[PDB]
Amino acid sequence: TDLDQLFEMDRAHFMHPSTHAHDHASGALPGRIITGGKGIRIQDHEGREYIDAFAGLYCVNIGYGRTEVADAIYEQAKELAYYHTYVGHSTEAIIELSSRIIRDWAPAGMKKVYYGMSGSDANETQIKLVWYYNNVLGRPQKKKIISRQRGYHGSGIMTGSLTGLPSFHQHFDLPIERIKHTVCPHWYKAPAGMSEAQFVRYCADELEKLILAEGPDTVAAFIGEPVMGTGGIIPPPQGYWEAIQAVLNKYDILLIADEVVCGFGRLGSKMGSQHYGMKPDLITVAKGLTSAYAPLSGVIVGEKVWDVIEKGSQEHGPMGHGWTYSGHPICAAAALANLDILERENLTGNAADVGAYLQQRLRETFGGHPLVGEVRGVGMLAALEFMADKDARTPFDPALKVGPKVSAACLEDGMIARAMPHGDILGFAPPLVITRAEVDEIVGIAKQAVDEVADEVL
Amino acid sequence: DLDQLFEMDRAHFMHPSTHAHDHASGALPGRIITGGKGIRIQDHEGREYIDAFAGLYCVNIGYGRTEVADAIYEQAKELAYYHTYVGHSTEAIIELSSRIIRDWAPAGMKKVYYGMSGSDANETQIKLVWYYNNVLGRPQKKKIISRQRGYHGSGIMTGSLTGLPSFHQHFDLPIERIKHTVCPHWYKAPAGMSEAQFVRYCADELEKLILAEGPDTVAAFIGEPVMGTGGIIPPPQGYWEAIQAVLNKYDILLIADEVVCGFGRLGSKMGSQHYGMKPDLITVAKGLTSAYAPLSGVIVGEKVWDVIEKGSQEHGPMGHGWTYSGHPICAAAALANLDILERENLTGNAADVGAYLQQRLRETFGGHPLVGEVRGVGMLAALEFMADKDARTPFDPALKVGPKVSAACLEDGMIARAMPHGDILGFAPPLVITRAEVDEIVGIAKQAVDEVADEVL
Ligand SMILES: [Mg+2]
């Protein structure tokens, strides 16, 4: 009957992202259908309600059930759901969005926006532009891209290669050539006894060593999230970005700021770049761009790169780059309504204020908890990393599944917080509309779940 | 105000497939599209056009379907988004998956994985082909054979699959592992070859390439049933059977790229059914939603799916996902789109009116002195312009014959595309088009072709 037939269809015909193919198909990993939501709460097919303390995947930033955004999508869909943006074609919506992103949200020196539908396709565009940039400048060898261990930049062949987490590489023959990875800037896991400043110098020196080992004239760009998202909610050490940028300047290497997660208020600033004083040449956005109301990505191109793009076109004609759905009208309309709401409600300010409250409440609650090795985060991102031996920084045996168990316990108590991959880490990325009262409720549920698992394993 | 919009556009919008400097300087003037209904669109000057290219082979049910807008709206109100990670779903994405497999895909297809573009779908394809071979213990079996003039997307990997040089130049493509065999365009065959000899030539050259590379190193072959962006090129009679026999011999997977051909465009469910192809993997987008929302699909056959299951048992969950995979509003748009394709029998209209289009273009242009070839099938057609018909000598590209014909059509209120890398006028109208509308398109094309013929002949 109805729901049972839907789950049967799901098992038989729907290949999910990031889902154990056989267990899901067999029914051992049970399906869940989401039927609605409002604010920070979602509802499933059994009528159970959950506090979504992960905002989908760091993306439902204005919260669920915004009929204002639905209306805007509808209006555009009625007027003109689609035409292409090839050979200088546009809608009013995509033009207004481009101007608004550059004028109101992007850091200084940014000029143009190129649109796709995912964070992954945006980073794909980024590498194409970096390679084109160097070819038109007469530097055919200057092509390598430096990423970082535990960075997350997407799930394709090139983009999965940028990504620094092994599950995105396994059985896909990644990373492909030209992509290198430097160190994860996680001070908690630094060589023992290193101060924060020593650790920063270590990260800068290791970057330099890698650049010199590869040949600086062969290295084109460096890509990094301001704060690492999927690699575990890892804020950089104090002074990290200034030290990295001095190395990149020395060897004439472009900085790509991956703002897929950090963009559009998530850290309590416009983007992560402004938050940390980064000066990127190229910026990747998605997620909070539309609050996931529709799929849209952006590549924000600085003046320096844009100027060379123009020159390339003068010498060689139009660049061979386009997606059919680049600048999709309904997606642009969703973004505009999303920005209106972020601005009108000052959700960047709410993220800074309530986010700091979240940071503080998690430190007070879990700072001395025997299961918790580190409490970390910034703005509206936070995490608890679970360790078997706190003082030595000895992780649990992965087979124990401490992280997933904490997450599952939260879920039983009606709260969604993610077991982050490749470690034992509980992650929080709530919608930016969250209140202090809602934070207290999330923290209390997390506390119970962490206590419960601590009893089982300690 | 219109001037202010264009100033914003020039200053801040990087378009796809647009001369960056000329557009920024104003030398390539912008165009804003404000509306459309049926086969007709409207621009910022209030000028109206017959869109004989359906956007980019994609607005298949026609413009202004408030039924689809309503469906998008309803889903957006109820739940615009949640992820589909770790077995999560909406009812819409489940219904869509079952409907694609049961009603549209060829026999033997089992699962659908969702993205947002034809390009990201082909990216997924290569991941699956590599994963498939690694889990089977064949780490060398990884090369992908594509074809000259094939179009498969505009990324690094997908642009490498693509066989048109504009998608490669200054991007260092194609990357390693990607090879290209011959374009199956009989009109441009080695001189004297009959149609059957040309098919044998294509099969033999494929086999030679496979043997030169080492068959044990070749994982897949990717092909559009009919080549779209490479010039509206239907395959020769018997081509697909001959190619498939070579693929079967060396145990090579067939990826049918149905981004254009899918969902009624040729007068069949997909190009695969039309030509009797037996793919292991299928790529869809465009006509999946009629572009009302961005959605792509990878349709996975039983054979590949079974290995995917086994891989998960041995190695855990596959590391593949996009944030927006299975996006609810996009799924709702597809469902409404399918309802309309089915209810109005647009596959049947595409077969019937498409045959009329084929016939009318051959009668009108078969002996035209500018036209070297008239080709097409179903609701795809093209005219290729040549300087010397019997010798098959193209015009000097600098003459811009194709673009000039297209521009002349446009002046007379019809959009038909000057296809890249040659002098080719392309047609891919919405599937709702009538015979009377076909006559009008052909008449405008006739005038435009005559006008340019006067200038250059
Ligand atoms: Mg060998």
Structure characteristics:
homodimer, 458 residues, alpha/beta, Aspartate Aminotransferase, domain 1, Aspartate Aminotransferase, domain 2, 2 domains, 7-stranded mixed sheet, 4-stranded mixed sheet, 15 helices, globular, binds magnesium ion
Please specify the SSE layout and strand pairing.
The structure is a homodimer.
Chain A: H1 2-13, H2 21-26, E1 32-38, E2 41-44, E3 49-52, H3 55-58, H4 67-80, E4 89-90, H5 92-105, E5 110-116, H6 119-136, E6 144-148, H7 158-162, E7 179-182, H8 196-214, E8 219-224, H9 240-250, E9 254-258, H10 272-276, E10 282-285, E11 297-302, H11 303-316, H12 329-344, H13 347-366, E12 372-378, E13 381-386, H14 402-412, E14 415-416, E15 418-419, E16 425-428, H15 436-457
Parallel strand pairs in A: 3-14, 6-7, 6-8, 8-9, 9-10
Antiparallel strand pairs in A: 1-2, 2-3, 5-11, 10-11, 12-13, 13-16, 15-16
Helix pairs in contact in A: 4-12, 5-12, 6-11, 8-9, 13-15, 14-15
The structure holds magnesium ion.
PDB class: transferase
Keywords: directed evolution, transaminase, protein engineering
Assembly: dimeric
Question: What this model shows, in words?
Answer:
The structure is a homodimer. Chain A has 458 residues and is an alpha/beta fold. Helix content of chain A is 42%, strand content 16%. Chain A has a 7-stranded mixed β-sheet with strand order 5-11-10-9-8-6-7, with helices on both faces. A 4-stranded mixed β-sheet of chain A has the order 1-2-3-14. The first copy, chain A, is built from 15 helices and 16 strands. Chain A folds into 2 domains: 179 residues, Alpha-Beta Complex (Aspartate Aminotransferase, domain 1); 279 residues, Type I PLP-dependent aspartate aminotransferase-like (Major domain) (Aspartate Aminotransferase, domain 2, 3-Layer(aba) Sandwich), CATH 3.40.640.10. The first copy, chain A, is globular. Chain A starts with a helix and ends with a helix. In chain A, α4 runs antiparallel to α12, α5 packs parallel to α12 and α13 packs parallel to α15. At the A-B interface, α1, α2, β1, α4 and β4 of A face α1, α2, β1, α4 and β4 of B. The structure holds magnesium ion. Magnesium ion binds next to loops of chain B.
